[PDB]
Amino acid sequence: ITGTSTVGVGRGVLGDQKNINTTYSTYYYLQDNTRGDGIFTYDAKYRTTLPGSLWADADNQFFASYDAPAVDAHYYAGVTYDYYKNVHNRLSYDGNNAAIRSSVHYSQGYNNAFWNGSEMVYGDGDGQTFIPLSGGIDVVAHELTHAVTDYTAGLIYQNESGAINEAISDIFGTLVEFYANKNPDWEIGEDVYTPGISGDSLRSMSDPAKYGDPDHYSKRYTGTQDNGGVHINSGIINKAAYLISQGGTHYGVSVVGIGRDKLGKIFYRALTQYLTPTSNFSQLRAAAVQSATDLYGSTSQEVASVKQAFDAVGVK
Ligand SMILES: [Ca+2]
Ligand SMILES: [Ca+2]
Ligand SMILES: [Ca+2]
Ligand SMILES: [Ca+2]
Ligand SMILES: [Zn+2]
């Protein structure tokens, strides 16, 4: 929409108040002109027709409970845009400042959030398993990270390359959570998952087996459910990323941690320079070793820790 850039105020899903970039033309629209070619948030109105209507508001105030999921989708898209720009010098998901579009209120009682190849889509959850999915910055950054992958490595969403594609999104969603720095951790979706239970989540990176996911290659899932286990087998790579960052001893193999910033640098470089559509786990290991070598040199602690972490999860 053509009009002027303004600043609105509203409340997110978890009741936190925040400023949002809007655009004024008769109404105030959730259209942020300050980042690339814009961030646009739409109302799907409990239907599944996409994108729906660009979110319009009469007074630039977004405090109705109906407003909350749009507030968070809009604001966290902006945090993720800044993470990639300031940390990786990447401008939007295509690297050319493509518009980031998101729809909330998708369908009824929909317990999921996804990138559909063109935009982000969030369900409201059923109030029991999930509250509105855009309330979790790690969920927002997870799904936007799939857009990043699609424009770079283009890892096919099946078997091993698929589990890599899932792991990358868990890794960068966690790193965005740490970057924004509000109660960060190594679990996925804790903020929006089961309002009745403390400390649970969808998945754990520090301990995948907590929720039934393999933490070692010898335990990979080899059936056909979940596109050959893209959500299950991601646990092996998640645990490797956790060990590279934090360090630890895992099945008797010791790893010196190098911190989150270097983990991000190494995996961002592997993603954008070395992985291809069909990459398997062992090729992920080579790409990450070559990444660490370009960045830190072949004799470095960083390279040594990458090899140790992949050793610990059984990936040679
Ligand atoms: Ca209003
Ligand atoms: Ca958290
Ligand atoms: Ca988290
Ligand atoms: Ca919970
Ligand atoms: Zn995913």
Characterize the bridge pairing of strands 4-11 and 61-62: parallel
187: left (phi over 0), alpha (psi -120 to 50) or beta: beta
- The two structure tokens encoding residue 138: 């790690």
Element (H, E) at 31: strand 31-32
Dihedral over alpha carbons 197, 198, 202, 203 (to 10 degrees): -150
CATH of domain 6-154: 3.10.170.10
Triad 184, 185, 190: Cα angle to 5° = 95
Other C-beta atoms lying within 10 Å of the C-beta of residue 231? 18
Residues in the chain: 316
End-to-end CA distance of the chain: 52
Structure solved via: X-ray
292 to each of 268, 302, 315, how far by Cα in Å?
Answer: 11, 6, 17
- ∠ CA 184-190-195, nearest 5°, is 135
Rg value, the chain, Cα: 20
CA angle 309, 181, 289 (to 5 degrees): 20
Expressed in percent and rounded to 5, the helix, strand and coil fractions of the chain are 40, 20, 40
Distance 197 CA to ligand 4 centre (A): 4
Cis preceding linkage at 195, omega within 30: no
Angle between helices 281-296 and 301-312 (to 10 degrees): 170
CA dist 186 and 178 (Å) reads 9
CB contact at 8 A, 310 and 285 = yes
User: Of 143, 160, 250, 302, which residue is the catalytic one?
Assistant: 143
Reported as type and span, the H/E element at residue 18 is strand 17-25
| Cβ proximity of 11 and 71 under 8 Å | yes
Q: Would you tell me the crossing angle of helices 281-296 and 234-246 to the nearest 10 degrees?
A: 20
User: Any known ligand binding at 250?
Assistant: no
Given the structure tokens 């370009």, which residue do they identify? 294
User: Which residues, at least 6 apart from 197, have a Cβ–Cβ distance to it below 8 Å?
Assistant: none
> Cα(165)–Cα(24) distance, rounded to whole angstroms?
38
Q: Which tokens is 302 given?
A: 């960083």
Residue whose tokens read 């040199």: 297
The answer to whether the CB of 139 falls within 8 A of the CB of 206 is: no
Contacts 24+ apart (CB under 8 A), 194-203: 194/128, 194/129, 194/130, 195/127, 195/128, 195/131, 196/128, 203/170, 203/231, 203/234, 203/235, 203/238
| Cβ proximity of 74 and 135 under 8 Å | no
Ligand-binding site membership of 166 (annotated): yes
3-class secondary structure, 104: strand
Q: How far apart are CA 193 and CA 221, in angstroms?
A: 25
The 10 Å CB-count burial string (b at 16+, else e) for 269-282 is: bbbbebbeeebebe
Q: Which helix (H) or strand (E) holds 243?
A: helix 234-246
Q: Annotated binding residue at 59?
A: yes
Rounded to the nearest angstrom, the distance between the alpha carbon of 146 and the centre of ligand 5 is 7
160 noted as active-site residue: no
CA 49 to chain centroid, in Å, comes to 24
Domains in the chain: boundaries: 6-154, 155-315
CA of 10 from ligand 1 middle (Å) equals: 8
183 known ligand binder: yes
The torsion angles phi and psi of 255, rounded to 5 degrees, stand at -135, 130
> Which amino acid type is present at position 200?
D
CA 206 to centroid of chain Cα atoms: 16
In DSSP notation, 129-159 reads: SBS-GGG-HHHHHHHHHHHHHHHTT---SSH
Distance 171 CA to ligand 5 centre (A): 11
Quick one: tokens of 243?
């060990």
8-state DSSP, 14: T
Residue 30 has which token pair?
């959730």
d(CA 34, CA 102): 16
- Say how many Å lie between the CA of residue 81 and the centre of ligand 3: 18
**Is 124 annotated in some ligand binding site?**
no
Domain 155-315 belongs in CATH node 1.25.40.10: no
Helix (H) or strand (E) holding 105: strand 100-106
CA 3 to CA 84: how far, in whole Å?
27
Query: Two tokens at 69?
Result: 């999921």
**Catalytic residue selected from 105, 216, 231, 250:** 231
149 vs 141: CA distance, rounded Å: 12
* Ligand 3 center–CA 176 separation, angstroms: 9
Q: Is 143 a catalytic residue?
A: yes
Say whether 185 counts as a known binding-site residue: yes
- Tell me, in Å, the resolution of the deposited structure: 2.2
Which ligand is the nearest neighbour of the Cα of 157? 5
Helices 68-88 and 260-269 sit at what angle, rounded to 10 degrees? 80
Which residues, including other chains, have CB under 8 Å from residue 44's CB and lie 6 or more apart?
50, 51, 52, 103, 104, 105, 106, 107, 121
